């Protein structure tokens, strides 16, 4: 089997040589004629109370009004972010959940976790009470991140090293994406709804298409497990957060690692990464009970958002980019602007 | 008319918010009174043989156990529907007040990897506060296994030769001293890492049990009482 090793080595060094040849110049010196981003630290405008256990996941939706928060008590709470009033408090069959999703329409909500099942509920029903709409089962591992792309098909990331794209009505699996060797922990959808990227515990982010089951591209460059992922608002770049206390911005077209955000005073892992609307500010939640905002051009620490007593679990930015929601393990959601 | 309608719907939204907040506050008392337990162990460790008369009341990802002792409900988890990697879903169990860690003391390799798993659970950053109730399952199997003479303890642990039974150890009646020496050697092998990295915060509660003993619920009740008392004493900055 020495010929297989030789072929793998020759393809690997061909990839390395192509990446080196296409790396004509780094982008650190490219962003040299631009002004630095000032200190734009923000204050907690509202704090959401009511959860009885730690908050793990969170989502916004198209309108920047209806937050979703998932707790390990077994609660999916939908919050009105403006006036601070809870709208629905859905109880769950399995208390251990790690993901929640809000559809582009306001009709459906989703959840999943250690039960290996993605449960979706209606919101605007005829009777007026929330109930278990559908029960997508078929994963042999824990769900980490489920994301809606429409009202009829969903994409889910599981710990069984495989991602899936399900259809809602028939309850079957439309496509199955395999090729990771570690637990897939994060999943982000491109704005055009044609591609997505999944970060795993392989120090690897794989970019997949939704029409075909094949893997479009693979990105390496981390040292530990990837916990968070997010496309650029343009859709031709993405940022990955990992446990090596470094964020890494990759670009789609060059298949190259571009920017490494790291510091010598940080050793804690990175749990949640979300971009701003313009793509300049990069908000990353850390395990040192704080969050850090960087810029995507100078790779400098723009500011620090503090005020959590436990580790951060989820970080989100509205589609219009106004409010930033941080949910940590002290049962509190903080809204920033 | 539009202003009246918007005031009416604002009042209705406030009323619904107050109602569901009252429901959450009502469920809070029931939630923070039943103690949660997370059970860990190997395939041959005797995972489901801890509690037998509450094992059957009459999904496969998580198996559940409800059992009530002295008007206190105990809500027991065991996770077996996932894969062998466990560094990511063990962070979902930060808030659990006790880890029931069951060790097979008969088959050995097995005890070394159980010891390594105990090291990983004890030294984990998000499990650094959780107390571990450690069960030494299959004590009878160990009792005939150490008297069989075919398996030598020295081969799998070179430090057994320079070991003696502790004076604080109370041997059970009706057994030779060598099985007591073996059991307390295993207990000390677990306690040497149980009492090395934890500077307060959490300690272990070693217990001996088999497939016949039916008093494990009482031991779990006493351990949980000690755990909650210690947490209350620590949260009042009483060092």
């Amino acid at each position: 089997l020495d010929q297989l090793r030789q072929e793998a080595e020759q393809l690997k060094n061909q990839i390395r040589d192509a990446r080196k040849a296409c790396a004509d110049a780094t982008l650190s010196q490219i962003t040299n004629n631009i002004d630095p981003v000032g200190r734009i630290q923000m204050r907690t405008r509202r704090t959401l109370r009511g959860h009885l256990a730690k908050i793990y996941a969170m989502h916004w939706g198209t309108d920047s009004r209806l937050l979703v928060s998932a707790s390990q008590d077994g609660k999916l709470i939908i919050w009105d972010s403006y006036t601070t009033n809870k709208v629905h408090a859905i109880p769950l069959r399995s208390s251990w959940v790690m993901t929640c999703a809000y559809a582009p329409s306001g009709n459906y909500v989703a959840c999943g976790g250690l039960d290996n099942i993605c449960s979706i509920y209606n919101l605007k029903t005829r009777e007026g009470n929330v109930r278990v709409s559908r029960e997508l089962a078929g994963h042999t591992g824990y769900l980490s991140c489920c994301r809606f792309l429409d009202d009829n098909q969903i994409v889910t990331s599981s710990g069984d090293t495989t991602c899936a794209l399900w259809d809602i009505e028939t309850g079957q699996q439309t496509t199955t994406f395999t090729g990771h060797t570690g637990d897939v922990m994060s999943l982000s959808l491109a704005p055009d709804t044609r591609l997505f990227v999944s970060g795993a515990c392989d120090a690897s982010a794989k970019l997949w298409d939704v029409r075909e089951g094949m893997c479009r591209q693979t990105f390496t460059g981390h040292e530990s497990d990837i916990n968070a992922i997010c496309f650029f608002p343009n859709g031709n770049a993405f940022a990955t957060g990992s446990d090596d206390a470094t964020c890494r911005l990759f670009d789609l077209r060059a298949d190259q690692e571009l920017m490494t955000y790291s510091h010598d005073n940080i050793i804690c892992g990175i749990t949640s990464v979300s971009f701003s609307k313009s793509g300049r500010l990069l908000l990353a939640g850390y395990d040192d009970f704080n969050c850090n905002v960087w810029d995507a051009l100078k790779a400098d620490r723009a500011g620090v958002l503090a005020g959590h007593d436990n580790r951060v679990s989820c970080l989100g930015v509205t589609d219009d980019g106004m409010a930033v929601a941080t949910g940590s393990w002290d049962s509190f959601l903080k809204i920033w602007n | 008319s539009k202003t009246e309608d918007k005031r009416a719907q604002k009042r209705a939204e406030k009323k619904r918010s107050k109602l569901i907040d009252k429901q959450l506050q009502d469920e809070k008392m029931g939630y923070m009174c039943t103690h949660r337990l997370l059970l860990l162990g190997a395939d041959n460790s005797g995972k489901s043989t801890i509690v037998k008369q509450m094992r059957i009341l009459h999904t496969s990802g998580i198996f559940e156990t409800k059992f009530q002792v002295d008007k206190v409900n105990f809500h027991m988890f065991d996770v077996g529907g996932q894969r062998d990697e466990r560094r990511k879903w063990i962070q979902c169990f930060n808030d659990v007040t006790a880890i029931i860690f069951v060790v097979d003391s008969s088959d050995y390799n097995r005890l070394q990897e159980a010891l390594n798993l105990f090291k990983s659970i004890w030294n984990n950053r998000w499990l650094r506060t959780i107390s571990v109730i450690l069960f030494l399952n299959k004590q009878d199997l160990l009792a005939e296994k150490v008297l069989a003479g075919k398996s030598k303890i020295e081969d799998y642990f070179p430090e057994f030769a320079r070991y003696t039974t502790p004076e604080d150890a109370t041997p059970e009646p009706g057994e030779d001293p060598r099985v007591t020496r073996a059991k307390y050697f295993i207990r000390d092998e677990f306690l040497r890492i149980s009492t090395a990295s934890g500077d307060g915060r959490h300690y272990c509660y070693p217990h001996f049990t088999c497939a016949v003993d039916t008093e494990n619920a009482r031991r779990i009740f006493n351990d949980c009482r000690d755990i909650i008392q210690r947490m209350h004493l620590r949260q009042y900055e009483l060092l």
Partner: nanobody
Framework: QVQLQESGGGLVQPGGSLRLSCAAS????????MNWVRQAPGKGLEWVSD????????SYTGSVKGRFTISRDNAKNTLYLQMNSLKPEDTAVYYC?????????????????????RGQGTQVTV
């Protein structure tokens, strides 16, 4: 890319001391701690030894105590396993692995051939 190339071992005569070498590229070698794991034919993955970041805290399993030694140099970014003579029951394939968190002392590096940060390994027989 993080990779752990391995060399040494195999057709080894008994009575001689050899040095199984692991060369690490990718991760910074100083910030992490490393493990040696072995797999026998017909048996599962078995942890053999572990060494911390500074090399002060070294731990072994019971079956290798007093005979095998493990060490590492961060300046050369290399790790070594010194073995004296052999054992008739050590015919196995050896992997050098790393738990995926730098500044921790807890690791989960035994899998059913599904772990990521683990080298190809070298097979040694007597």
């Amino acid at each position: 890319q993080v990779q752990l190339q391995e060399s040494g071992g195999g057709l080894v005569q008994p009575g001689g001391s050899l040095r199984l070498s692991c060369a690490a590229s990718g991760f910074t070698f100083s910030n992490y701690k490393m493990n040696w794991v072995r797999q026998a034919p017909g048996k599962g993955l078995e942890w053999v030894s572990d060494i911390s970041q500074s090399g002060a805290s070294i731990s072994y399993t019971g079956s290798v105590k007093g005979r095998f030694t493990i060490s590492r140099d961060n300046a050369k970014n290399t790790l070594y396993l010194q073995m004296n003579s052999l054992k008739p029951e050590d015919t196995a394939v050896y992997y050098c692995a790393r738990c995926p968190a730098p500044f921790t002392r807890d690791c989960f590096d035994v899998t059913s051939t599904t772990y990521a940060y683990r080298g190809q390994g070298t097979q040694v027989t007597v």
